[PDB]
Amino acid sequence: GVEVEWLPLGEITKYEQPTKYLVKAKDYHDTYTIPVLTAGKTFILGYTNETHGIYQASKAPVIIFDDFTTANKWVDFDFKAKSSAMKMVTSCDDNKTLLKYVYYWLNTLPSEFAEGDHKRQWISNYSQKKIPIPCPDNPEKSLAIQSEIVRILDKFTALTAELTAELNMRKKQYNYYRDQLLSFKEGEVEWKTLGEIGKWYGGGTPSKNKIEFWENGSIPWISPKDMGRTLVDSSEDYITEEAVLHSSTKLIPANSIAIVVRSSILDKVLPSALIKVPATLNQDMKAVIPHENILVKYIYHMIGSRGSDILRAAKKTGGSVASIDSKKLFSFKIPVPNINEQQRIVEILDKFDTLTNSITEGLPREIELRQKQYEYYRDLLFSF
């Protein structure tokens, strides 16, 4: 603490490369036991961990990714592979280091390790120096005096991992809860064909050669890369209010739902957004406005519930970029009950998913706050 010496990195560090492998049989299905692990998310599906030159990841070294990436680190979790880029960083010394300490102390250098600019490899950079080290406490009580902060950082990283785990748990339980409750409604709950709730609108797009129709303005121009979000308040592009002269767009009210119809689906769940501003959107998506028989959040969450079947309702329509057409999107019939059982049940379901995600009163943004304060308290390490 008071006796901190800047020791070089490779003084107590053994660097090596992964051995020879055949880690890829031509089918790598989930039923096998070792996880194929890379950068980003360290989990691809199962492989068999024997008779392939395996390193099998003994008791906690760390790794490097990658050529040209140079940022991602991992603690070897239980016993995993060496998949094609896991060049090993570990320790020669085994009574001072406790190299999860220096794993944490890679986050004492994101300063020079933030700018990966050219085509580049940084072997000598981690190979030489430096790191502040509580030496001259070798090997007596250095782990004992860093035991405080490693208890702190272990429980905080554990907090982050379990918060991601329980966020998965809340989303999983709530996705089952969407399908259990609010469905199969009877009786006799009325049956409404889609679009009869209110006349939905098509789209519209200007040219991009027109500079005066694209450069400035104040209408939110909603593209599907802006989509996938909930409670849309603005857009990336603030397109011109004059640009509606050659847009074929329609001005929509301030309580609408926005929904894409182009190729995010055919595999997965469709996007859906509450849009709060009068906006205009391109050919790549659509907007629906309801009318007079409803609550608008009931249409939103009814489409969100029935997404798993309206991805199927006009599913193929050819194997092209084309998708669910206007017809079988339009010609699906939904339950619409008595009036008091619109705003009651959506008051529960809105209250649940505003607790789940974003942004006001949402859990992963809180997790990001925790990651920010955790990295700041890692900047509150023993530098003193």
């Binding site: 490369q17 950068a39 990658d66 050529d67 490899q121």
Partner: protein, 163 residues
């Protein structure tokens, strides 16, 4: 197999030239008594050899025993292609300085497969969408990997000298 024909500085006219084969390591006295002398000590006429590298006709035998240690230190896939590595390096000592930098693609055989390895297996540029996975140019990316780094192609695989 990794041997020489070292005799003799005596008999410049080489009338029934002698001295057949000596593997490594090499004694001075055993070779000297095998080949005789010219009443003094001037020997090791390196006429013929069989080595993975090139050596001159005036090289001392101690330098040969020095080089044999570093040659026999390396694995066989390096020892099979030592001249190919010498086309980029300059000495066996300089090869011994950087003997762990050389990455060996036994699987890959040409630059298309090297690009396909760096993209599909590693994900060096990032994730690969499956609908994109067929529509990725490998030849131009292979040419730019060639012009960026330093790749050498042999019979076994591809040697990559990294920095």
């Amino acid at each position: 197999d990794m041997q020489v024909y070292i005799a003799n500085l005596g008999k410049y006219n080489e009338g029934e030239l002698v001295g057949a084969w000596f593997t490594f390591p090499i004694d001075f006295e055993e070779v000297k008594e095998k080949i005789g002398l010219n009443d003094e000590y001037e020997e090791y006429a390196i006429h013929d050899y069989e080595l993975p590298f090139t050596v001159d006709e005036y090289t001392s035998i101690g330098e040969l025993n020095r080089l044999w240690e570093m040659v026999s230190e390396l694995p066989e896939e390096l020892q099979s292609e030592l001249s190919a590595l010498l086309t980029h390096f300059s000495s066996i000592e300089e090869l011994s300085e950087h003997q762990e930098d050389i990455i060996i693609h036994s699987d890959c055989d040409d630059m298309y497969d090297v690009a396909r390895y760096y993209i599909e297996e590693t994900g060096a540029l990032g994730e690969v969408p499956a609908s994109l996975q067929n529509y990725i140019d490998y030849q131009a990316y292979g040419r730019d990997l060639d012009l960026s780094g330093t790749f050498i192609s042999t019979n076994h695989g591809i040697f990559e000298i990294v920095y």
